[PDB]
């Protein structure tokens, strides 16, 4: 499974109901991930998380929103006929994050404290890399000259 | 003592309808979820659905969405499977089923004497 | 849709030994920490009566001779020691998720 998400499930029969918090103390805004499944089927669902009307809440200074699963069959993606939909969002410095739910969560393990900076962006290009240093940088190459244009 | 007791065995003409019933005893019926099950003579077992007895809601499996009806008396604790337009290969031994726990798929404990409809001309 | 596969189709054991039933699955059944495989027996004429759940707990008034073993996607329900009480037809289930099938049968017979 990913990495940075955990997919949380109930144990010993029991989904119990979480409230778990997190208030950003890093003085940088923080990317936190999640993620609702939408189980195929009401069995998986029934199964995964021991409840038929799940939802998931979560809450901040400003953001709140609440996610109910949608159960249905569908494509076979990946071999897979549930979906998982992911959210994300910046809670800034001071700001508290409160997830809750009685199922459905996939839950964050690992987020992200973000430093901005100018001048970097993001290429798309399948270019190759040597250990060559440039002043400027393109998709295609890079450019290492003088010229205006 | 805990128990499910059905309704007796009956016959049903082709194309003719069937109402089994399922009265639960010495349990809180509506907490436990109740499918209903049937078992072709001389076959295996097959699974109809569920109905959660609290809600009224119900599971059907695809081979029995469009003619089974689920329901349930809460009153007198009791569910009901309605078997319409009924079919020869649908003959068999119809059980309800009560789940061993709440919430959790747990498996089937409480089992009914089981109901046997025939089908035929 | 998960099929319970499941074999072998008939057993021919003699009292006291072991009877090994093996169920397999299209897919895992296994989460939550729980394996969602339930094995039963239904001797002639009568409801099936759980005998494990969950693959591996035994349920209450079961003798302590069946027993539950595997995960993910394969099962085996072992019975032992072999009694005359345990002729019968051994069946599979899953409650991972809809629709519960089962898994086709087992009949066992007194070897002899």
């Known amino acids: 499974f990913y990495k940075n998400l955990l997919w949380l499930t109930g144990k010993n029969g029991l989904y119990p109901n979480l409230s778990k918090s997190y208030a950003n103390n890093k003085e940088k805004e923080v990317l936190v991930l999640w993620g609702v499944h939408h189980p195929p089927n009401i069995g998986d669902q029934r199964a995964l998380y021991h409840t038929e009307n799940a939802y998931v809440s979560v809450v901040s200074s400003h953001y709140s929103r609440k996610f109910t699963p949608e159960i249905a069959k569908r494509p076979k993606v990946r071999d897979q006929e549930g979906r998982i939909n992911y959210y994300w969002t910046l809670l800034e410095p001071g700001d508290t994050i409160i997830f809750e739910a009685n199922g459905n969560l996939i839950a964050p393990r690992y987020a992200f404290a973000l430093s901005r900076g100018f001048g970097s962006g993001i290429i798309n290009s399948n270019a190759p890399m040597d250990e060559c240093d440039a002043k400027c940088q393109t998709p295609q190459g890079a450019i290492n000259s003088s010229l205006p244009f | 003592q805990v128990q499910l007791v059905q309704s007796g065995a009956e016959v049903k003409k082709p194309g003719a309808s069937v109402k089994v019933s399922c009265k639960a005893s010495?349990?809180?019926?509506?907490?436990?979820?109740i499918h209903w099950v049937r078992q072709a003579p001389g076959q295996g077992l097959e699974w109809m659905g569920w109905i959660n007895p609290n809600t009224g809601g119900t599971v059907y499996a695809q081979t029995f969405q469009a003619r089974v009806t689920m329901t349930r008396d809460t009153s007198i604790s009791t569910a009901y499977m309605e078997l319409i337009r009924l079919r020869s290969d649908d003959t068999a031994v119809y059980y309800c089923?009560?789940?061993?726990?709440?919430?959790?798929?747990?498996?089937?404990?409480?089992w009914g004497q089981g109901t046997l409809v025939t089908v035929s001309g | 849709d998960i099929v319970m596969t499941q074999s072998p189709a008939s057993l021919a054991v003699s009292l006291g030994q072991r009877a090994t039933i093996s169920c397999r699955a299209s897919?895992?059944?296994?989460?939550?920490?729980?394996?969602?495989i339930h094995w039963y027996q239904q001797k002639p004429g009568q409801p099936p009566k759980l005998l494990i759940y969950?693959?591996?707990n035994l349920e209450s008034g079961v003798p302590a001779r069946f027993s539950g073993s595997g995960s993910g996607t394969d099962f085996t329900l072992n019975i032992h020691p072999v009694e005359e009480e345990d002729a019968a037809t051994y069946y599979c289930q899953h409650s991972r998720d809809t629709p519960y099938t089962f898994g086709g049968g087992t009949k066992l017979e007194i070897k002899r």
């Open positions: 969950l693959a591996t």
């Open positions: 089923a009560r789940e061993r726990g709440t919430g959790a798929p747990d498996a089937f404990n409480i």
């Open positions: 897919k895992s059944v296994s989460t939550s920490g729980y394996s969602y």
């Open positions: 010495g349990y809180t019926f509506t907490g436990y979820y």
